[PDB]
Fold this protein.
Amino acid sequence: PKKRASNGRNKKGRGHVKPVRCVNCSKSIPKDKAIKRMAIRNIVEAAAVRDLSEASVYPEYALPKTYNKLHYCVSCAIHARIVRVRSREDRKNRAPP
Amino acid sequence: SQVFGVARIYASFNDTFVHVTDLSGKETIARVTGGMKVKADRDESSPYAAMLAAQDVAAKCKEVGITAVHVKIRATGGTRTKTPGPGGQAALRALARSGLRIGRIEDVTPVPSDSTRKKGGRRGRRL
Amino acid sequence: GRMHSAGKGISSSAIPYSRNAPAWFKLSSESVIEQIVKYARKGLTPSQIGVLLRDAHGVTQARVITGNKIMRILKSNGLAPEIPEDLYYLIKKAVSVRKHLERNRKDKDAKFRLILIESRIHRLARYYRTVAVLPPNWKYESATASALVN
Amino acid sequence: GRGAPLAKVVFRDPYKYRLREEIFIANEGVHTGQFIYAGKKASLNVGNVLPLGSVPEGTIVSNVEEKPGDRGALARASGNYVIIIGHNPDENKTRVRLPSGAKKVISSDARGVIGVIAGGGRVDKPLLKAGRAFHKYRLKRNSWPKTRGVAMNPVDHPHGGGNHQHIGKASTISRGAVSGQKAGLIAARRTGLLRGSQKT
Amino acid sequence: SINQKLALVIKSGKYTLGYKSTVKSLRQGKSKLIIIAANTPVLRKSELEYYAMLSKTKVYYFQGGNNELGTAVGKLFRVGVVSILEAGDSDILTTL
Amino acid sequence: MRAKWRKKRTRRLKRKRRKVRARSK
Amino acid sequence: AVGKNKRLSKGKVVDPFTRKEWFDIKAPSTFENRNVGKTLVNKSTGLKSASDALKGRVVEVCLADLQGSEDHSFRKIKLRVDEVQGKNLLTNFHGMDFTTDKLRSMVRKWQTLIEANVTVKTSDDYVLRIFAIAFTRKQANQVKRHSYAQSSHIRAIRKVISEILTKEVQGSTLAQLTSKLIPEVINKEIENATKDIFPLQNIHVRKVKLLKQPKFDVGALMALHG
Amino acid sequence: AKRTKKVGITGKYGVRYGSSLRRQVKKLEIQQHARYDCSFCGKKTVKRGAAGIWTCSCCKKTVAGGAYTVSTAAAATVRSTIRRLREMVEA
RNA sequence: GGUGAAAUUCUUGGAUUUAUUGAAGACUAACUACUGCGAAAGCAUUUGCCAAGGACGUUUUCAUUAAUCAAGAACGAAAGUUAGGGGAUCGAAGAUGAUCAGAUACCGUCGUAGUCUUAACCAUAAACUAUGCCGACUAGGGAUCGGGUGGUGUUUUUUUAAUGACCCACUCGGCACCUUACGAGAAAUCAAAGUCUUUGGGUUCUGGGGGGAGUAUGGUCGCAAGGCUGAAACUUAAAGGAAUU
């Protein structure tokens, strides 16, 4: 039967959505169906912070960060534990943790 | 004061390049990778290999006379992983420990604006 | 509605209840009639005649101020067009679309819309031919339509 | 005998009161009454004869000189052209790509006409007829029809003879072979139908 | 907008089409604007420019050939140059 | 058997029948 | 990997650093910090002419490093060597670029990104492509979550931005453009000209690249201009 | 108003040479015998004289073009790239 | 370089890596959303041109011109066919290295056709919302997109009309969503899948146990691949749906 009212994606009023490639397996998956997550990370791994700061030329350097958007196919997201299988009643929870 | 070069770290998977050029990027000094520091193919991008490479690069650049590095991180980019490998952080930490001064960290991973075509096929890497 | 689209829009004129209206109009039926005639001679379809009358003059509806509607005035006074204005405008739109298509052969959307517009033209023409305001054996042809417009 | 049209261009003699008629290989888009400009200072327009050093990278050129002054050697057949790949200003040498895909290094002073050669797409039409082939070659040269060597006798060809029509020995012939031996596939690196591309 | 202004002057004002009529009107000093097709011969365009410089008229250069100018005027043939003798109701002379 | 592969097999059978019939006629 | 090369020399060392030597890089006068760094080069032998082997090279420098101000940390400047005077080589403008960090930090969703680019030439025949970035912002007191532009505001904004960029380039030489770009007055100009259409925050001029430059330009004026 | 279903101008070749070769010849023969616009005078008077020669019968102008078309796609693309390079050079 | 590890491959004729350029072709990241448009297929770089369109507003016009539709038509992803161009990337076939009992598979490196385009064909998709179209009515709620209306409600010209962008209250029309069961349903679930044993608003199409079989045959369309139409003999007691432990 119909597992989800949304068919496991986000497409109402479109028909077609251009695909993206999974960042792990490079599988084509419609952009609305992907498990895109925005990863914003410090460059210095939060463990070399003091070492880099004390070895820097400038005092109170800003320490820029890196941004990327990771697009995930359903298989790769489940395997990498980006998402997990939930119970039937709380699959409907749209709210992020 | 400090003599400035560019660290030019390439943290891919299965390898990590660390090599300081001059400020213009044309004069290459101390090109050392993890594969020349480790034996097994699987460890070429290990953090230990990246660190050994960074220590060697720091030694050679200090011998040359360069005292500070503008650090430029880069993953494979293009249609590839675009996430820095396990050795970039090890390399920069090792440089900082080696004590060459650092300034202006940046990430220069080539990011496509509508790339050509990712490899692996439509169904991906079925492993 | 929207015989040729999926739109379900309700948007029209809320005609006032009163027929003997509007208690602020001091002009005369004859004055409005000769305004109708002057605009028609100037060369205006009943749609825009009624628009400018309601819009620059105070004319709530020519139907309620006079005893009859603008097309009736024009037909009684000899100013009725050779073809009705709605069919004329449909033919003008079809001519414009066909002229566009001749240059843009690749415009499949324009081809589809031309099909729709010409279907509307043929339906309107069939109605007009049945009610006999258009002569029998009148038929819309793409070749002669541009000359028919002007 | 030529698939490309020729253009007769009249120039003024700079040293005497004379008119000089030059015979050019017509580039596609050239018309009668058109002004052609030839020289170092000529502008990048179809039909002009700028040097390679004066044209930029990616330029389409035709009737290109192999050495400066030879009056046109490369890219002269209909539809063919030369791509300008690069420049080496030190000992001025323009790198170009030839119609066969070969990379060549020519002097930067070698002339060339901008554009492609007219008459392109000629070989897209099937001849359909030994008659059309006959009329084609009747004013090129006596090279048609072509009898197969296997259909001759052994006196007439290396392939001739036998009780069946067969070559007998490998049809790939050495480059060091001699006249009378060089009949077949001369110095062939490989044979057979290859699935491939321009690879250039 | 120029095509719409040309249609408006065609409907309301006075125009004449063709090189001979245009040159004759330029000679008489009655022409108020001349539109010249993009593909008109350069010698003819130069002569029309010279005539218009002598007679102090305005020259507009159509972004289209004689076919396009004929369609813009509203004729089913080709016109190389059209001289507006009076706009009538258009603003073609006033605007650029 | 997957329905798509059964469909392909039936297409192959159909074209083989067509070829044999055209040979006989 | 250290000992797995099967064939590294098909056929069957002097130290480059002692072979080389050091030069000194000087930015134009439009920046506060004249000296920007050093570079290596092979000593000029009789057949190499180190001057010409080094003349056509560019250096990326942070505008914060050039100006001694930490507020320029997200800008970059390309300096192209054009002359050499005995270990005092002088550079000129090539292009301003942003930082990848700055771009990705300014780009967030639930808002509209607007991009424009213009290819207008300067007064002294420098041809540049200037890229302007803009972002719609939420007004204070707004309860709506996104604050998007209506794609006609977008076209009006792009037109206004392009007009500002074209007018500001045509009317100023390259030195004037750099002198008016370090204080990013053009950002304020665009912001004022666009505030009547949409709030439009984060209006920093993105990269400008030098597509082509005029002739040698080597004799009598960058004493005053660098 | 059509005497042949699909052979068109290649009905002169009868049943010979094969359908595919006759189809290719049909395409190129329609192009080669067609009449083209003259960019100079604006009339459909441009004909092929020989392979490459395209002569307008009204303005008496000869043009160098394709073997079977007044202009080939390669020629148009080359003209576009040459224009782009010229404007990059000039400005 | 690549992998779970490897190997195929390149590499002192300097490979990978660095910087500056150049070319080609493809694509249009982030912005990008339970957001927009289109009849669907689909459509995401900027400007210009060309026509078109829904919704809203109208105290404008005609006046039943309308709804659904055998026959007959237009468009119709991808792959595919024919012929030019193009041919970067990826890559049915194929090559090749692994893995394996085997492995002409997954994994790896190449790589023709193809992927792009022009002209002409094809006419299929889990072409899906597996939900025909038109109309009326039946619960609550918030959010959102387009239009409109009313609020000396907030930012600067002008802290002293305008406009804009927001904030409130409605309103019409969309893509949807949350809650509940008046109801419906085999249930999953559904604001329609309701107003249907208290059975009738109008209309088109389709199905009648599972296979054989979308086969055979005839027809027709197509260059072909195939598309549309389309059985029977024979065989069989279950196939199947939704839920429960």
Chain F is about 90% helix and 0% strand. The first helix of chain F runs from residue 3 to 24. Helices of chain F lie at 3-24. Residues 7, 10-11, 13-15, 17 of chain F lie near RNA strand I (CB under 10 Å from a C1').
